[model samples]
Target chain A: VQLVESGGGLVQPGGSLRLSCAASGFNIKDTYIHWVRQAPGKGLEWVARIYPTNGYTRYADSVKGRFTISADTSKNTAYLQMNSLRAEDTAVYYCSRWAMDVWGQGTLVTVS
Target chain B: VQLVESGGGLVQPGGSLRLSCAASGFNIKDTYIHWVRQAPGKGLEWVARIYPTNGYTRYADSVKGRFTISADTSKNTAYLQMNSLRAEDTAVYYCSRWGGDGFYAMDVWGQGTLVTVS
Candidate 1:
């Protein structure tokens, strides 16, 4: 079974960033990559997801503006980027595969 | 636009029960209702979903043994009940719908139901 692994720690202000979640132990080409955010003391919110095999993508209406989801099949990894950071956007973001099957430990992002 | 409203807060020990999300406004008879759970400091996980149109259902592979989702199109409501809840089950629950296009990706969401297990 493949497991999603992510980088850790908080993000600083005006930070230009790219975080990756690599899928290991499974065939990454056969799965969908999803990104989700859980704000401090709040519920989970869907960001976006992508199909590495076809480059198809979808985002929740709330995240349609500033966030982007992409993947590299060759590297078996998925990426999430947020621009123009704000404190409200700070949260623990996770990367998962398929219908929430395997999940990354989650990267805690704080815009301060 | 239909809305999913769940019952307020509740405190319960590990047991069996049914929680609901009632929709109002547009005809909910045509929508699909999904249930998700957000544990403290964790991402959302799909528990299950029900299509009121045909009474069809789908559950996440991780959620097995004792969770069920059902609907009443006539009443524009959906229900989620867990047979044997544990302390680990304490979390905020949400109800949502398919993105108005008969596919995945939730658009609108319920305010949320907080469950505390002791």
Candidate 2:
């Protein structure tokens, strides 16, 4: 029932980054996990999603071929990894359940 | 590319409600339209979504059997309908477009309409 995302930091352009979301009160492998983000004063965008049970993953066209989403069943966590960081990647990223009704507080990543 | 929501108003308890969202800069019938609601101080909730391309529909567990999502292909508009309205139904409803094929990402959003039930 609770999804926690920690580890927000500043990354330089063209650098690599990985974001984590730890799930508790629910099994991460039992449901679909999604990553969404919103830039400063911008609307919400779906970045990617992963289903741990089946190892199925999908990414939005905006981040296709760059962003990778994976899960760590042993830790009950899901992750979003990316490289070639750019200013447009600066935003508050959130992880949620499939229906997307449940969401994390969001971690702000600043790319400079 | 743009979603404009309309048709929000106060409804008496037990009444029915319908909201409209018009899409522009893209063909509504070509993609999926999703409906979401946020209470005064609560987080976002997924209501329903409709895919005009194949007439596919999905509803959130919260609104199952009470909410319906549909679209008007010719007008490029989407509609959300609900019945047995209650005070808990009051919120700002937003209509969004799927980011792309095969995923549930909402890349484009509407300004949202406020609906109240008393």
Candidate 3:
């Protein structure tokens, strides 16, 4: 399966950012979609995950209250939205399939 | 939760490398642990995962024949052993908790250790 993620742009602090990942070659309803990120030179950070079939979602404490993960099975797409952005939130975000077997090319989101 | 990785250093091509991750504030045998890596300027790669309690393990097809994942319950540590290393294997290796409770996320991550193969 392949995933194409939407491009993210610079956003001011206290603003919001929404990123999208469009999946092809597989039905998104069949598995879990996860969001992970990496700061410029940092290790991976688990952001959140959504199970499309049931709309069940879980978020990391780091982004728990400020982030929302969602999906549209019909479009084979997943989304990640975050509010109250901070400089620390700048990173390259990726979408992956179950157990991270398939990963999106990743999109950079910068908060300044 | 915290994870500390060790056993990273330069290794000759065709040699073997073993990486270790020690978990604190959790029990290694009670949950599934995952190994992930990223080459310089590259995307994340899932290497393998293991459930120590039952010894169940899964490896990414790319390294299936040469990568082994195991854990030591007594030490709350997980290990990744890769044989026949190549220069492409140079990357930062990380160990993470598969999921906690009912949350489907890798909430805790190790600082990551760099392994260089030449």
The candidate maximizing TM-score is 3
Q: Which scores greater on TM-score, model 1 or model 2? A: 2
Distance from true location, Cα of A86 in model 2, Å = 52
Worst 10 residues of 1 chain A by lDDT: A63-72
lDDT of candidate 3 over A1-112, digit per residue (tens):
6989995889998677778989999998899999999999999999998777755667776774456566766678888767667789999999999857899999999998
lDDT of 3 by residue, B1-118 (tens): 7999999999999888889999999897668899999988878998878766533466666666466665666678887877778888899999999776328678888999999996
lDDT of 1 by residue, B1-118 (tens): 5556665355465565667888877555567788888988778877877655433456654544345555555567777756557776677888887767556578778888887775
lDDT of 2 by residue, A1-112 (tens): 7999986689987666778899989997789999999999899999988777644566776775356566667678887776556789899999899657689999999999
Off by over 4 Å in 1: A1-112, B8-12, B102-104
Candidate 3: residue B70 Cα off by (Å): 1.1
* Model with the higher TM-score, candidate 1 or 3: 3
Candidate No. with top lDDT: 3
Winner by TM-score between candidate 3 and candidate 2: 3
Taken over the whole model, the C-alpha lDDT of each candidate is 0.68, 0.78, 0.80
**DockQ score of each predicted structure, in the order shown:** 0.01, 0.01, 0.01
lDDT of 1 by residue, A1-112 (tens): 6556565456665443456788888866687888888998999988887766654567675644345455656677777655445677788888888758788888888777
- Stretches of candidate 3 off by over 4 Å are A1-112
